[PDB]
Amino acid sequence: SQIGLFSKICRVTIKTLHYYNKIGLLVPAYINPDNGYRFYTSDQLMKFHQIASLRQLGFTITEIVTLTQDENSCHIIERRRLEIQKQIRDMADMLSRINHYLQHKKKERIMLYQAALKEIPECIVYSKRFIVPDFSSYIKLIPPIGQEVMKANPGLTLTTPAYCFTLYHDKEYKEKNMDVEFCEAVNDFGKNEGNIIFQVIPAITAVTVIHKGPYDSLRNAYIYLMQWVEDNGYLLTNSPRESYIDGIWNKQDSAEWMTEIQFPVEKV
Amino acid sequence: SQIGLFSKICRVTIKTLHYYNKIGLLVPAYINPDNGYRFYTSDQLMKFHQIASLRQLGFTITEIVTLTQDENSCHIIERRRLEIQKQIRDMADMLSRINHYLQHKKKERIMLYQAALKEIPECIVYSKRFIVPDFSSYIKLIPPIGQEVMKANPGLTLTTPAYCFTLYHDKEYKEKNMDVEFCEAVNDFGKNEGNIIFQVIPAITAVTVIHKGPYDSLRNAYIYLMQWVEDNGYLLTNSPRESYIDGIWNKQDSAEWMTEIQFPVEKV
């Protein structure tokens, strides 16, 4: 049986048989020496059936080679099974994210706020945890901290890139009684003089949105991130962070400012 | 911000930014014309945020290069959603098949049979449906009936490959007096003669199991397929076929006879 007849018996392409002969998965029963013509046999079909049976389970080709040439490989079927359930979990996550994306696109004609899930590494910060009378007043006590720390900690170099964020320890929304905590990432440890203390913040997987524009429409992004959290079955594991990437310090226009809100979450 | 600092901001590889600038998505703000250095801005951070948000949803990159500038394209999200739904339903199918595979290596010391789905196209066959008392007389009675057909039908030529098979139109287990229907695919219509008629047998999806060995143990393959159909959440749609690939016509030793059982099946 030539390769054209075998490809019609097997209902597979000829190039598939060429590839399987090249890699050594399915070798023809007899190859004509002068022409090169591959000839196949029923005993090759009995093996192509096994190849197809394994390949329909999503096994990679090299896994199929290992399974059919070397027996007692029950660890490879377990690896493929665990990977299949992991991919199923990831696929359910992706499905929820794309359903949410369509309900939002069908909600507002322009999408102002995309949501991205990113992992934040561990870091060394100096932090001051304090009760703030108003969000407008929160901005006032930060530049005092910025000069005082550089005067009190000489040669202290902030990391690059600059991770300067806020920990919202409030489990509910309020305007005037915010128990907030100002953090700023630094390269190495230091002295803990004053109300400013040093600490490490654990690496977290967090869903983040970057808000461009003034600080009054941030409630939109928070409700959106909360909406994302309720829609996609995540649970808030830690306090939300507020990372100030660009602001009045690089650019004078207040509507081009940008900050990224991070929601530490786990899928539950 | 040079490509290294920006790549540290986004926690992404420099090769990713190089590739992106190559394909046109996320071109940097300023390309130094002297040395080719790529400099980035926070506006590229905002473009990359949504790039990564779509990439985390499964969209291919060439889908992203249309999705992020032709913002009104909305069919590509329900399209990606239906595509992911098809992939998840297949992954869940594969998961049931691998757990079943594992159960079978627990049940039997050897994976003697290996099931595999295949699509059997529609075909014009000559068919004779009747009741037979046993297997020995049925096996003996087939070849004279074939000589009768191939002689009495001038111009009738067999199909390449040679698909000769049987259907079992019973509903309960009959070891004897089995309402069997023999068919053999022909390239074109011949005229009916007596109890043998011609018809076109519809294209089906079927699970298949090859049995290399004597004929008195093909019932085991059916048992395996029945367990496979009941376990893996499948349903027998039509009468189970049995295709004769190799037999008394090509080889004289019974221990190397290879026959393939086909169960027309659909998933629940």
Ligand code: 118
């Ligand atoms: C210590 C030192 C600098 C800043 Sb800032 C800032 C950030 C958020 C809200 C208000 C101010 C800063 C600068 C670069 C990168 C990230 C943050 C700052 C610097 C100069 C002038 C005004 C403000 C804060 C603490």
Ligand code: 118
């Ligand atoms: C018409 C009907 C049946 C057979 Sb065959 C057979 C031949 C070639 C390829 C496939 C099948 C047969 C039997 C004895 C001698 C010569 C040919 C046949 C036998 C048993 C069961 C099914 C088919 C041949 C023509």
